Write a protein that binds this ligand. Sequence first.
Ligand SMILES: CC1CCN(C(=O)NC2CCCCC2)CC1
Ligand SMILES: CC1CCN(C(=O)NC2CCCCC2)CC1
Lengths: 193, 193
Amino acid sequence: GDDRELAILATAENLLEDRPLADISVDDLAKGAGISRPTFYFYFPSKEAVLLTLLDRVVNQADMALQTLAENPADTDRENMWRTGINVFFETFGSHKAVTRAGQAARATSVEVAELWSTFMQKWIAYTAAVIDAERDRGAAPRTLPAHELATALNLMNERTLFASFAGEQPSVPEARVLDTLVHIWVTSIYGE
Amino acid sequence: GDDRELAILATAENLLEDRPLADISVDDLAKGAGISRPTFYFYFPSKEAVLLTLLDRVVNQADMALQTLAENPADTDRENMWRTGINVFFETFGSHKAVTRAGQAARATSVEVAELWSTFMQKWIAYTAAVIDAERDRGAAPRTLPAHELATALNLMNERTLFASFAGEQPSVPEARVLDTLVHIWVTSIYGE
Ligand SMILES: CC1CCN(C(=O)NC2CCCCC2)CC1
Ligand SMILES: CC1CCN(C(=O)NC2CCCCC2)CC1
């Protein structure tokens, strides 16, 4: 049923680990999923549409994990507060590196993928800015830059730096160092004057 | 002569302001440059090769401007030191937004463009790290993160945030606010404990 759907998705995520979407075929996806090519087309219009769904699931998984954290304060200092939050993104995207990688590239060619990234980025930035503002209101953070602008740059840093690290780009921060690196820059830029 | 070359380059940069490289033709470039299509192919193997050269020129212009700054210290505090430096990139790339935009997209499809970006990014990060280290050695900056790792994240932030701003992506820092935004995060993360 939608078991077939789940299978198409699992096959695509598995195949994306080995090669880019350009070198994966609908025949490849159908085969791996144990269905014919016409049956594939019943569930998805295109292999592009498969990636879109995989990216949607990863993005929503991150978002739901962040919502959980936001509802349950971990009983910490400001550094571990931000760390735990950044770590949601580090772990979620880091657990799905092939979807992350293919979904990042697809931004250039797919308006739907571009808009999905854009929608969630705006949400995560707004949440970052709300937290910074609450930190300023409680007297914990100084009123320096506009919170939303600061939040924008810090989120864009995270996007670029996490994904470079996961892809092993040259240059990149080693994956085992990237959390500490980002948390330092967040805590210093948010609390520093 | 290489006047024709310069003309091909000017035409391409002009046309990239209006549409992506995919919708610009060799006939478009030849026409604008006042030459035939075979004459074009004498000077460049492909329209992809034209972009590569345009990107090479912009990247080297930034690099040369940074070398000039590095040879002549501006007589300032630490904040204006970093600002003047970031401003080299803000002004150089900001003066060539269409090449910036097309060259960023071309990373995904062109190994030569990927390697060009990568070579200069490594140079600029190494220079950033050298400056941070000299700041630490003089007792002006605390020994926090590994300088090279800090330098990596800050450069990757700048890349992503400048180029989002220039493209007017949603989300992005307004172009008129991006310099102040980046300088704050650099100065706080470099000098802060
Ligand atoms: C796809 C991006 C989205 C933003 N990212 C990220 O680490 N920011 C978090 C930090 C903790 C509070 C919410 C936002 C990087 C990955
Ligand atoms: C293409 C990138 C390269 C790096 N960028 C940049 O602003 N960094 C500068 C800051 C001043 C010292 C040298 C490095 C962003 C644009």
